[PDB]
Design a protein around this ligand. Structure first.
Ligand SMILES: *[C@@H]1O[C@H](CO)[C@@H](O[C@@H]2O[C@H](CO)[C@@H](O[C@@H]3O[C@H](CO)[C@@H](O)[C@H](O)[C@@H]3O)[C@H](O)[C@H]2NC(C)=O)[C@H](O)[C@H]1NC(C)=O
Ligand SMILES: *[C@@H]1O[C@H](CO)[C@@H](O)[C@H](O)[C@H]1NC(C)=O
Length: 373
């Protein structure tokens, strides 16, 4: 909980822009930081403080004790699957193993600001657009760009001076019990819930954008997702399809409010695509929009999402697969064209190692002001 001196932590800078209707786009000095749990933490004598996703009780009985004795280290970002250049960020599901195979480095990054706190994105009544390359992501792979209402300082406190510069304080709508819940040891082994907007969870075969609203207590773990295949338009998204996933494309997510201003109440989430210089038509007539969100209705639904988006959330980038489900909920069944088995990590690392997602040209701001005439 003090920054280690062995591996200096240098955050790779990723060029992002905030855009106004009248003032145009202004560049931000944003970087990316890899998640807390991916890091090695040790003693002053190089005895580790972590052991198997759980602290080493000999060294962290206390949180005061653990603040004093422990030092969390920097990261080889290229080794971790992360490579960055200009506005572009490439994330690799796998990296070569010295022992001959492929290690499954599964990066989770956050958008960090100049001050060393997370760059909070206020998106109620606002839009966020980026370009993506998911051509090399097959079934069962999750290239993900989302937001979470995590603390901007990552939860840093008197006993944790590392904080967001080391990816501290992750939370999501699945309320995960982290070994450090918001910057401090989870002695209680509690779960950390917070509102989570998923802009993209996708591969070249299927995709979904999901809002998950939360009370302070709990979350709508499975939100009111929007998958075009699952809504009937099965040959809309895919290689060669209306939106060609084999080439780069542009994703615009628009958070529409009743009064038109960030001050208002969130009433819809509209998704628009552009590729090959042209607006790609919506799957459903009159727009790919989320108005109704029944699942969230026990959590003040879709309105509380707008309040968290208005407060400002943390930008998260990720790529992963699950050994349990094969991501079948995303790309299989009536949600996509993949087999129940096809999505299994075994088949992936065999057939598509170095499957990777490329996020680029992230911009956010006034609606209509982030895309280009
Ligand atoms: C929790 O952390 C404890 C304490 O940092 C770790 O235990 C330590 O492990 C190292 C290496 O296994 C021991 O090193 C040896 O120390 C003795 C005397 O220092 C020396 O004669 C040896 O040549 C070697 O340097 C160290 O003593 C030991 N310390 C204690 C207090 O047990 C440990 O890795 C963690 N616990 C678990 C269960 O993993
Ligand atoms: C996370 O930690 C920060 C600072 O220690 C605290 O301000 C913030 O409230 C904590 N988390 C939550 C749930 O607020």
């Amino acid at each position: 909980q003090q920054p280690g001196t062995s591996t200096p932590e240098v955050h790779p800078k990723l060029t992002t822009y905030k855009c106004t209707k009248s003032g145009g786009c202004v560049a931000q000095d944003t970087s990316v930081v890899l998640d807390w749990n991916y890091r090695w933490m040790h003693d002053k004598n190089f005895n580790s403080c972590t052991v198997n996703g759980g602290v080493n009780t000999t060294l962290c009985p206390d949180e005061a004790t653990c603040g004093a004795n422990c030092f969390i280290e920097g990261v080889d970002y290229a080794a971790s699957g992360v490579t960055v250049s200009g506005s572009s960020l490439t994330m690799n599901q796998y990296m070569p193993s010295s022992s001959g195979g492929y290690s499954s480095v599964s990066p989770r990054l956050y958008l960090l600001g100049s001050d060393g706190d997370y760059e909070l994105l206020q998106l109620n009544g606002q839009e966020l657009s980026f370009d993506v390359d998911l051509s090399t992501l097959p079934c069962g792979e999750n290239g993900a760009l989302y937001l979470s209402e995590m603390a901007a300082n990552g939860g840093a406190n008197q006993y944790n001076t590392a904080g967001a510069n080391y990816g501290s304080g992750y939370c999501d709508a699945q309320c995960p019990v982290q070994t450090w819940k918001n910057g401090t040891l989870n002695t209680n082994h509690s779960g950390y819930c917070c509102n989570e907007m998923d802009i993209l969870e996708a591969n070249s075969r299927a995709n979904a954008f999901t809002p998950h609203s939360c009370t302070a207590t709990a979350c709508d773990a499975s939100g009111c997702g929007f998958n075009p295949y699952a809504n009937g338009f099965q040959r809309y998204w895919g290689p060669g399809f209306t939106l060609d996933t084999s080439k780069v494309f542009t994703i615009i997510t628009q958070f529409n409010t009743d009064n038109g201003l960030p001050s208002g109440n969130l009433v819809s989430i509209t998704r628009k695509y552009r590729q090959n210089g042209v607006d790609v038509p919506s799957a459903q007539s009159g727009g790919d929009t989320i108005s109704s969100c029944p699942s969230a209705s026990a959590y003040g639904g879709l309105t509380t999402m707008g309040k968290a988006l208005a407060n400002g959330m943390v930008l998260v980038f990720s790529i992963w697969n699950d050994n349990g489900g094969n991501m079948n909920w995303l790309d299989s069944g009536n949600a996509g064209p993949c087999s129940s088995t096809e999505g299994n990590p075994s088949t992936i690392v065999a057939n598509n190692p170095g499957t990777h997602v490329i996020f680029s040209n992230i911009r956010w701001g006034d609606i209509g002001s982030t895309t280009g005439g």
